[PDB]
Amino acid sequence: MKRKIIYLASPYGFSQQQKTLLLPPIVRALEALGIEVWEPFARNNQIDFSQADWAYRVAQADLQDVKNCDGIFAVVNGTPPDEGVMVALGMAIALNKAIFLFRDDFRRCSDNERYPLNLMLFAGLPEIGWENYYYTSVDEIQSHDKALYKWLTG
Amino acid sequence: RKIIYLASPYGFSQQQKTLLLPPIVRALEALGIEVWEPFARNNQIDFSQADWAYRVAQADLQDVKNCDGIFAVVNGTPPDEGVMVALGMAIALNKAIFLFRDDFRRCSDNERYPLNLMLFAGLPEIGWENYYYTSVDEIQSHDKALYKWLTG
Amino acid sequence: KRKIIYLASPYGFSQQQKTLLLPPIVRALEALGIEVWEPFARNNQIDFSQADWAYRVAQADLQDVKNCDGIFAVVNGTPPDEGVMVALGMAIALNKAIFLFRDDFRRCSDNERYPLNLMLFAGLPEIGWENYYYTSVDEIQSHDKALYKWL
Amino acid sequence: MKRKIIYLASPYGFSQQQKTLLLPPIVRALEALGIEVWEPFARNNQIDFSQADWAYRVAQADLQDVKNCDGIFAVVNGTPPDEGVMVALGMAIALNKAIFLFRDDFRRCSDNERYPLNLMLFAGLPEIGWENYYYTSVDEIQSHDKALYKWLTG
């Protein structure tokens, strides 16, 4: 009955249009699985951007959310994936959080032939079956055959 | 010897690997640091096997876990994603953090720092600049955090 | 003849961005009387099962830039998209009208005068280039900016 | 062999170490073919960077060099290739300059399966034989079986 907490890491807060139009459908798909979504652009609405220390406070606030999530859902679109998202993904791998990756961007940005992206993004995923954690469309988030659903049900 | 994980995108180009990395390695070794540079350290991995990518990732993860600090080359627009994953690991594991950027361009989401604020989450609010190196010649500096960290 | 805008963007690469972000921009331009040439839609006819599809898309995009009246370049991202940048360089060298769009508040710059790499502004005047630089979809139809005046 | 003019577009001037160590070998490889190299970071050292209009002056100078060159030699390393290089490449394609591409970066940043990079970089290259204009190592620049050399001897 306690909802699992997902940190929703994305570059979508940087573009006015992307923040308005791309994130809400992703948040809704995750919430339809029963997830408690911590999305940092929304959770940092409160922070007083008129202070000189706002960037440091956002950094610490995001760090605490990653430490206290149960898993990360990392939007890794872009060439290359966003550096903020990557730092958060690294934190979550090191803290043994559950890892889920989302990329509906069909371009390749890779240093290898096994994975569609730089191999470091998959260090927290299994050698076999990592594709089950790798979502390629918003429509796929609901899938009972993929790893987010299975994680929530055991 | 304190151990530094030297994260960089410099293994990706023939020239960068042979020309850019050794000067940085030498500058760190001249401080008495044992340098763990992943492109060199994973040279014994068999790149004819399908699982080589997985083994590099696991080896890199273990080196981050076992290092004492990360020295992260964060050049580029934006910084390299593999360097960033490694930086994130190091922050979460409470490793010492040192950043290197001799790229004068800005790739930032704020005005306080020259780069995305998440890179500085493992550095102090005041004096983070002491951990931020902007030239190979500055690495040896007695007044910057790497030296103080070794002699502290 | 309606004026023709080549709408260059990285938005066709992401399924969601293609669906949600491009139609509002197309509509804002068309509401000004513009005929919009958006290459991901214009190249939909190409047979992507054939090995020459990438060459045919490149030549189609090149011809569209040659035949447009101006480019409206979505230069979001860190850095701006390389496909959009090649089209922009083409448009600049061909004396097409240049309009830039960035609603990404991040900075990817090599100078202090402009918010982006200085080469993106090579086709814009020294004074008043900000009039050609759009930072929101709402601002596209500003009767005070360069697109409206150009029309 | 003719002494043709090559605009050497690269991102290497942005990093102190790369400007010092990566750019001169490429300049020398081109000069070793008898080419007159126009390298913009060096060519704009004349400009007064204490004036507010220095960025405008560098852009116009670069634009003029692309107009007046015979070909571009574009260093298209990085994920993605550098945006200033890409604008210059676009200018050169539309001005029917000769086009030569250099990438010794072994990562892929591509939107297709025919080319190793975004297809727009190859719009001014032939459908068949574009590989002869595509260089993947400094040592290869001198090859008389590739298009730079043959362009000089025609």
Residue numbers in the entry:
A (entry chain B), D (entry chain C): 1 to 154
B (entry chain D): 3 to 154
C (entry chain A): 2 to 152
How did the manuscript describe this experimental structure?
By homology, E88 acts as a nucleophile, forming a glycosidic bond with the donor substrate. Our data show that CtNDTE88A is catalytic inactive, as expected, but CtNDTE88Q retains some catalytic activity, albeit the catalytic efficiency in comparison to the wild type is reduced by almost 50-fold. We used the inactive mutant CtNDTE88A to isolate the substrate binding step, the less active mutants CtNDTE88Q and CtNDTD62N to determine the involvement of each of these residues in binding and/or 2′-deoxyribosylation, and a wild-type enzyme to obtain boundaries for the magnitude of the rate constant for the 2′-deoxyribosylation reaction. The association rate constant for 2′-deoxyadenosine binding (obtained with CtNDTE88A) was 0.76 ± 0.01 μM–1 s–1 with a dissociation rate constant of 39.3 ± 0.7 s–1. kcat/KM-2′Ado-25°C = 0.016 μM–1 s–1 (determined with the saturating concentration of nucleobase) sets a lower boundary for this bimolecular association step. Stopped-flow data were used with enzyme variants CtNDTE88A to estimate the rates of 2′-deoxyadenosine binding and release, wild-type CtNDT to obtain the rate of 2′-deoxyribosylation, and CtNDTD62N to obtain the rate of 2′-deoxyribosyl hydrolysis.
Here, we characterize the structure and function of a thermophilic dNDT, the protein from Chroococcidiopsis thermalis (CtNDT). Nucleoside 2′-deoxyribosyltransferase (dNDT) enzymes catalyze transglycosylation via a covalent 2′-deoxyribosylated enzyme intermediate with retention of configuration, having applications in the biocatalytic synthesis of 2′-deoxynucleoside analogues in a single step. The reaction catalyzed by dNDT proceeds via a ping-pong mechanism, with the formation of a 2′-deoxyribosyl-enzyme intermediate covalently linked to an active-site glutamate.13 Transglycosylation occurs in a stereospecific manner, preserving the anomeric carbon in the β configuration in the newly formed 2′-deoxyribonucleoside. As with other NDT enzymes, the active site of CtNDT is formed by residues from two monomers, and therefore, it is only fully formed in the dimer/tetramer.
